[PDB]
Short mmCIF file of all heavy atoms in Angstrom, two decimals:
data_model
loop_
_atom_site.label_atom_id
_atom_site.label_comp_id
_atom_site.label_asym_id
_atom_site.label_seq_id
_atom_site.Cartn_x
_atom_site.Cartn_y
_atom_site.Cartn_z
N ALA A 70 -8.72 -8.36 3.55
CA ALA A 70 -8.75 -8.59 2.14
C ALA A 70 -7.34 -8.45 1.61
O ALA A 70 -6.60 -7.60 2.05
CB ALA A 70 -9.70 -7.60 1.48
N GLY A 71 -6.95 -9.33 0.76
CA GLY A 71 -5.60 -9.31 0.25
C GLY A 71 -5.40 -8.34 -0.88
O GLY A 71 -5.93 -7.22 -0.89
N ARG A 72 -4.57 -8.76 -1.84
CA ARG A 72 -4.34 -8.04 -3.08
C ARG A 72 -4.48 -8.97 -4.27
O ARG A 72 -5.18 -8.60 -5.22
CB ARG A 72 -2.94 -7.43 -3.15
CG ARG A 72 -2.55 -7.05 -4.62
CD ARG A 72 -1.53 -5.94 -4.63
NE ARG A 72 -1.10 -5.43 -5.92
CZ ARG A 72 -1.61 -4.35 -6.50
NH1 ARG A 72 -2.60 -3.70 -5.94
NH2 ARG A 72 -1.14 -3.93 -7.66
N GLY A 73 -3.83 -10.17 -4.21
CA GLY A 73 -3.73 -11.13 -5.30
C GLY A 73 -3.55 -12.55 -4.80
O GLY A 73 -3.40 -12.78 -3.61
N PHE A 74 -3.61 -13.52 -5.70
CA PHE A 74 -3.99 -14.87 -5.28
C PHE A 74 -2.80 -15.82 -5.23
O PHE A 74 -2.94 -17.04 -5.37
CB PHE A 74 -5.16 -15.41 -6.16
CG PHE A 74 -6.59 -15.31 -5.52
CD1 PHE A 74 -7.55 -14.49 -6.06
CD2 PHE A 74 -6.95 -16.06 -4.39
CE1 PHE A 74 -8.80 -14.40 -5.50
CE2 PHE A 74 -8.22 -15.96 -3.84
CZ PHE A 74 -9.14 -15.13 -4.40
N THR A 75 -1.62 -15.32 -4.96
CA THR A 75 -0.42 -16.13 -5.12
C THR A 75 -0.48 -16.79 -6.46
O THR A 75 -1.45 -16.60 -7.21
CB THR A 75 -0.32 -17.21 -4.10
OG1 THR A 75 -1.56 -17.87 -4.04
CG2 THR A 75 -0.11 -16.64 -2.88
N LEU A 76 0.50 -17.64 -6.73
CA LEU A 76 0.48 -18.41 -7.98
C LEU A 76 -0.05 -19.80 -7.79
O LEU A 76 -0.57 -20.38 -8.74
CB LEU A 76 1.88 -18.49 -8.57
CG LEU A 76 2.36 -17.06 -8.82
CD1 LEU A 76 3.76 -16.97 -9.40
CD2 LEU A 76 1.35 -16.37 -9.70
N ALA A 77 0.09 -20.34 -6.59
CA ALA A 77 -0.44 -21.63 -6.27
C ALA A 77 -1.93 -21.54 -6.05
O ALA A 77 -2.68 -22.44 -6.46
CB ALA A 77 0.24 -22.20 -5.02
N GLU A 78 -2.41 -20.47 -5.43
CA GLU A 78 -3.82 -20.48 -5.12
C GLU A 78 -4.62 -20.44 -6.39
O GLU A 78 -5.73 -20.93 -6.44
CB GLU A 78 -4.23 -19.34 -4.19
CG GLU A 78 -3.86 -19.48 -2.71
CD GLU A 78 -3.86 -18.15 -1.95
OE1 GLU A 78 -3.68 -17.03 -2.50
OE2 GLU A 78 -4.04 -18.29 -0.74
N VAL A 79 -4.05 -19.90 -7.45
CA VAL A 79 -4.75 -19.90 -8.72
C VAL A 79 -4.60 -21.24 -9.40
O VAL A 79 -5.54 -21.81 -9.94
CB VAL A 79 -4.19 -18.76 -9.55
CG1 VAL A 79 -4.46 -18.94 -10.97
CG2 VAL A 79 -4.83 -17.56 -9.11
N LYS A 80 -3.40 -21.78 -9.39
CA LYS A 80 -3.22 -23.12 -9.92
C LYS A 80 -4.12 -24.10 -9.17
O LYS A 80 -4.93 -24.80 -9.79
CB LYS A 80 -1.74 -23.49 -9.83
CG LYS A 80 -1.43 -24.95 -9.98
CD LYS A 80 -0.12 -25.13 -10.75
CE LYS A 80 -0.17 -26.37 -11.66
NZ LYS A 80 0.92 -26.30 -12.71
N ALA A 81 -4.07 -24.08 -7.85
CA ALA A 81 -4.91 -24.97 -7.08
C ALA A 81 -6.39 -24.87 -7.45
O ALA A 81 -7.13 -25.85 -7.30
CB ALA A 81 -4.74 -24.68 -5.60
N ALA A 82 -6.87 -23.73 -7.90
CA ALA A 82 -8.26 -23.70 -8.29
C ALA A 82 -8.42 -24.02 -9.74
O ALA A 82 -9.53 -23.89 -10.27
CB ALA A 82 -8.92 -22.35 -8.04
N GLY A 83 -7.33 -24.33 -10.41
CA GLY A 83 -7.42 -24.78 -11.77
C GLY A 83 -7.78 -23.72 -12.78
O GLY A 83 -8.81 -23.80 -13.46
N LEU A 84 -6.91 -22.73 -12.87
CA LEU A 84 -6.84 -21.86 -14.03
C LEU A 84 -5.45 -21.27 -14.00
O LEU A 84 -4.71 -21.48 -13.03
CB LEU A 84 -7.93 -20.78 -14.01
CG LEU A 84 -8.30 -20.06 -12.72
CD1 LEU A 84 -8.97 -18.86 -13.12
CD2 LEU A 84 -9.28 -20.79 -11.93
N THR A 85 -5.08 -20.56 -15.05
CA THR A 85 -3.81 -19.86 -15.02
C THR A 85 -3.99 -18.38 -14.83
O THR A 85 -4.94 -17.76 -15.30
CB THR A 85 -3.03 -20.01 -16.30
OG1 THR A 85 -3.75 -19.29 -17.31
CG2 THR A 85 -2.91 -21.42 -16.62
N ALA A 86 -2.97 -17.83 -14.19
CA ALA A 86 -2.81 -16.41 -14.03
C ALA A 86 -3.37 -15.70 -15.24
O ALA A 86 -4.45 -15.13 -15.19
CB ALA A 86 -1.33 -16.07 -13.87
N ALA A 87 -2.66 -15.81 -16.35
CA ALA A 87 -2.91 -14.91 -17.46
C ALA A 87 -4.37 -14.90 -17.77
O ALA A 87 -4.91 -13.86 -18.16
CB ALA A 87 -2.08 -15.33 -18.68
N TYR A 88 -5.03 -16.01 -17.53
CA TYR A 88 -6.44 -15.95 -17.78
C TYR A 88 -7.18 -15.44 -16.58
O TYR A 88 -8.08 -14.62 -16.73
CB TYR A 88 -6.97 -17.32 -18.18
CG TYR A 88 -8.51 -17.46 -18.34
CD1 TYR A 88 -9.17 -17.11 -19.53
CD2 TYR A 88 -9.29 -18.04 -17.34
CE1 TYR A 88 -10.56 -17.30 -19.68
CE2 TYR A 88 -10.65 -18.23 -17.47
CZ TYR A 88 -11.28 -17.87 -18.62
OH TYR A 88 -12.64 -18.12 -18.64
N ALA A 89 -6.80 -15.90 -15.39
CA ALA A 89 -7.57 -15.51 -14.21
C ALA A 89 -7.81 -14.01 -14.18
O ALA A 89 -8.87 -13.58 -13.73
CB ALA A 89 -6.89 -15.98 -12.93
N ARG A 90 -6.85 -13.19 -14.69
CA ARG A 90 -6.97 -11.73 -14.59
C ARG A 90 -8.01 -11.20 -15.56
O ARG A 90 -8.55 -10.12 -15.35
CB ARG A 90 -5.64 -11.04 -14.87
CG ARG A 90 -4.46 -11.97 -14.81
CD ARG A 90 -3.09 -11.26 -14.87
NE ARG A 90 -2.74 -10.63 -13.60
CZ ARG A 90 -1.74 -11.00 -12.82
NH1 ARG A 90 -0.94 -11.99 -13.19
NH2 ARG A 90 -1.54 -10.37 -11.69
N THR A 91 -8.29 -11.93 -16.60
CA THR A 91 -9.37 -11.56 -17.49
C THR A 91 -10.73 -11.99 -16.98
O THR A 91 -11.71 -11.83 -17.70
CB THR A 91 -9.12 -12.21 -18.82
OG1 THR A 91 -9.06 -13.63 -18.63
CG2 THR A 91 -7.79 -11.72 -19.38
N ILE A 92 -10.79 -12.57 -15.80
CA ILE A 92 -12.00 -13.09 -15.19
C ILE A 92 -12.33 -12.29 -13.93
O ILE A 92 -13.08 -12.74 -13.07
CB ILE A 92 -11.84 -14.59 -14.91
CG1 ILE A 92 -11.62 -15.26 -16.22
CG2 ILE A 92 -13.09 -15.23 -14.68
CD1 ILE A 92 -12.60 -14.73 -17.18
N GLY A 93 -11.69 -11.14 -13.79
CA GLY A 93 -11.82 -10.28 -12.61
C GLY A 93 -10.98 -10.66 -11.41
O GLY A 93 -11.18 -10.14 -10.31
N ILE A 94 -10.07 -11.55 -11.55
CA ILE A 94 -9.40 -12.01 -10.37
C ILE A 94 -8.07 -11.31 -10.37
O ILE A 94 -7.45 -11.18 -11.43
CB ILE A 94 -9.27 -13.53 -10.38
CG1 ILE A 94 -10.63 -14.17 -10.46
CG2 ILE A 94 -8.52 -13.98 -9.19
CD1 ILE A 94 -10.52 -15.60 -10.64
N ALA A 95 -7.69 -10.75 -9.22
CA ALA A 95 -6.37 -10.16 -9.10
C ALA A 95 -5.47 -11.24 -8.60
O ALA A 95 -5.81 -11.96 -7.67
CB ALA A 95 -6.34 -9.00 -8.14
N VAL A 96 -4.34 -11.34 -9.25
CA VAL A 96 -3.29 -12.27 -8.88
C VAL A 96 -2.07 -11.49 -8.46
O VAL A 96 -1.71 -10.50 -9.12
CB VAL A 96 -2.92 -13.16 -10.05
CG1 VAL A 96 -2.45 -14.40 -9.51
CG2 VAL A 96 -4.08 -13.34 -10.84
N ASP A 97 -1.38 -11.97 -7.44
CA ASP A 97 -0.17 -11.31 -7.00
C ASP A 97 0.99 -12.28 -7.17
O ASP A 97 1.00 -13.36 -6.57
CB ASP A 97 -0.39 -10.88 -5.57
CG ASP A 97 0.67 -9.98 -5.05
OD1 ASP A 97 1.45 -9.41 -5.87
OD2 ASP A 97 0.70 -9.85 -3.80
N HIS A 98 1.95 -11.95 -8.01
CA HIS A 98 3.06 -12.88 -8.09
C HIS A 98 3.92 -12.82 -6.83
O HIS A 98 4.44 -13.86 -6.37
CB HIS A 98 3.88 -12.60 -9.33
CG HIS A 98 4.37 -11.22 -9.39
ND1 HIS A 98 5.69 -10.91 -9.30
CD2 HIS A 98 3.70 -10.05 -9.50
CE1 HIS A 98 5.84 -9.60 -9.38
NE2 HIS A 98 4.65 -9.06 -9.50
N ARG A 99 4.03 -11.63 -6.21
CA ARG A 99 4.94 -11.46 -5.08
C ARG A 99 4.39 -11.94 -3.76
O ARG A 99 5.07 -11.75 -2.75
CB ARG A 99 5.41 -10.00 -4.92
CG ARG A 99 4.56 -8.96 -5.41
CD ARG A 99 5.41 -7.79 -5.74
NE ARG A 99 4.71 -7.17 -6.79
CZ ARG A 99 3.61 -6.49 -6.56
NH1 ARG A 99 3.20 -6.32 -5.32
NH2 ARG A 99 2.92 -5.97 -7.57
N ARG A 100 3.21 -12.54 -3.72
CA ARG A 100 2.77 -13.12 -2.46
C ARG A 100 3.35 -14.49 -2.36
O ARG A 100 3.95 -14.98 -3.30
CB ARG A 100 1.27 -13.25 -2.36
CG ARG A 100 0.83 -13.54 -0.98
CD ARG A 100 -0.47 -12.85 -0.73
NE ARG A 100 -1.35 -13.78 -0.06
CZ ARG A 100 -2.37 -14.45 -0.63
NH1 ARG A 100 -2.75 -14.31 -1.90
NH2 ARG A 100 -3.07 -15.30 0.10
N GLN A 101 3.17 -15.11 -1.23
CA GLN A 101 3.63 -16.47 -1.12
C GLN A 101 2.70 -17.17 -0.20
O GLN A 101 1.81 -16.57 0.38
CB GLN A 101 5.03 -16.52 -0.60
CG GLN A 101 5.95 -15.99 -1.58
CD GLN A 101 6.01 -16.88 -2.77
OE1 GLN A 101 5.98 -16.43 -3.93
NE2 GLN A 101 6.13 -18.18 -2.51
N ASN A 102 2.90 -18.45 -0.04
CA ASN A 102 1.91 -19.24 0.65
C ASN A 102 2.61 -20.09 1.68
O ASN A 102 3.11 -21.16 1.35
CB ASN A 102 1.16 -20.09 -0.36
CG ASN A 102 -0.29 -19.65 -0.55
OD1 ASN A 102 -0.74 -19.39 -1.68
ND2 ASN A 102 -1.03 -19.64 0.55
N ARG A 103 2.69 -19.64 2.92
CA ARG A 103 3.33 -20.46 3.94
C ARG A 103 2.35 -21.05 4.89
O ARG A 103 2.75 -21.75 5.81
CB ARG A 103 4.31 -19.65 4.77
CG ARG A 103 5.17 -18.66 4.00
CD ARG A 103 5.23 -17.26 4.67
NE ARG A 103 4.64 -16.26 3.78
CZ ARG A 103 5.31 -15.30 3.14
NH1 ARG A 103 6.64 -15.11 3.28
NH2 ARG A 103 4.61 -14.49 2.34
N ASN A 104 1.09 -20.66 4.74
CA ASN A 104 -0.03 -21.03 5.61
C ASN A 104 -1.02 -21.85 4.79
O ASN A 104 -1.37 -21.47 3.66
CB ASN A 104 -0.73 -19.79 6.20
CG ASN A 104 -1.87 -20.14 7.17
OD1 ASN A 104 -2.64 -21.08 6.96
ND2 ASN A 104 -1.98 -19.36 8.24
N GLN A 105 -1.45 -22.96 5.35
CA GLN A 105 -2.29 -23.84 4.58
C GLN A 105 -3.75 -23.49 4.80
O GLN A 105 -4.51 -23.34 3.85
CB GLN A 105 -2.01 -25.29 4.96
CG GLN A 105 -2.97 -26.34 4.35
CD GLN A 105 -2.58 -26.88 2.95
OE1 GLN A 105 -1.61 -27.64 2.79
NE2 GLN A 105 -3.36 -26.51 1.93
N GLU A 106 -4.15 -23.32 6.04
CA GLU A 106 -5.53 -22.99 6.26
C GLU A 106 -5.93 -21.65 5.64
O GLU A 106 -7.12 -21.33 5.60
CB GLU A 106 -5.82 -22.99 7.75
CG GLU A 106 -4.70 -23.61 8.56
CD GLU A 106 -5.18 -24.74 9.44
OE1 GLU A 106 -6.42 -24.80 9.65
OE2 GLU A 106 -4.33 -25.56 9.90
N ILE A 107 -5.00 -20.87 5.14
CA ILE A 107 -5.39 -19.71 4.34
C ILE A 107 -5.30 -20.10 2.88
O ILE A 107 -5.98 -19.54 2.02
CB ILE A 107 -4.52 -18.49 4.67
CG1 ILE A 107 -4.57 -18.34 6.18
CG2 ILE A 107 -5.00 -17.21 3.94
CD1 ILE A 107 -6.03 -18.24 6.75
N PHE A 108 -4.44 -21.08 2.61
CA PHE A 108 -4.30 -21.58 1.25
C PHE A 108 -5.58 -22.22 0.78
O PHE A 108 -6.11 -21.86 -0.28
CB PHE A 108 -3.17 -22.58 1.19
CG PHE A 108 -2.88 -23.03 -0.16
CD1 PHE A 108 -2.19 -22.22 -1.03
CD2 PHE A 108 -3.31 -24.25 -0.58
CE1 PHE A 108 -1.91 -22.64 -2.29
CE2 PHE A 108 -3.04 -24.68 -1.85
CZ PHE A 108 -2.35 -23.88 -2.70
N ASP A 109 -6.08 -23.19 1.56
CA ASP A 109 -7.36 -23.83 1.28
C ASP A 109 -8.48 -22.82 1.20
O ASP A 109 -9.39 -22.95 0.38
CB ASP A 109 -7.69 -24.84 2.38
CG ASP A 109 -6.53 -25.73 2.71
OD1 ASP A 109 -5.76 -26.04 1.76
OD2 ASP A 109 -6.38 -26.11 3.91
#
């Protein structure tokens, strides 16, 4: 289990950070996405 959803993984699901966190979703700005099969 991670911590937060990168910034792309939230964009890719079509919402923004600032809102996603009000929906129970933890977002991590300091993560990054170098792997696609984890991205998808």
Side-chain angles (χ1 to χ4, degrees):
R72 163 154 182 96
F74 260 114
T75 48
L76 301 179
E78 284 160 335
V79 160
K80 164 143 215 162
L84 41 161
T85 68
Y88 174 83
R90 344 189 77 114
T91 59
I92 299 314
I94 301 173
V96 209
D97 190 17
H98 56 113
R99 26 206 150 74
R100 194 145 135 256
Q101 292 293 135
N102 249 126
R103 319 134 243 250
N104 183 321
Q105 172 87 72
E106 348 235 343
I107 307 306
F108 185 76
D109 313 326

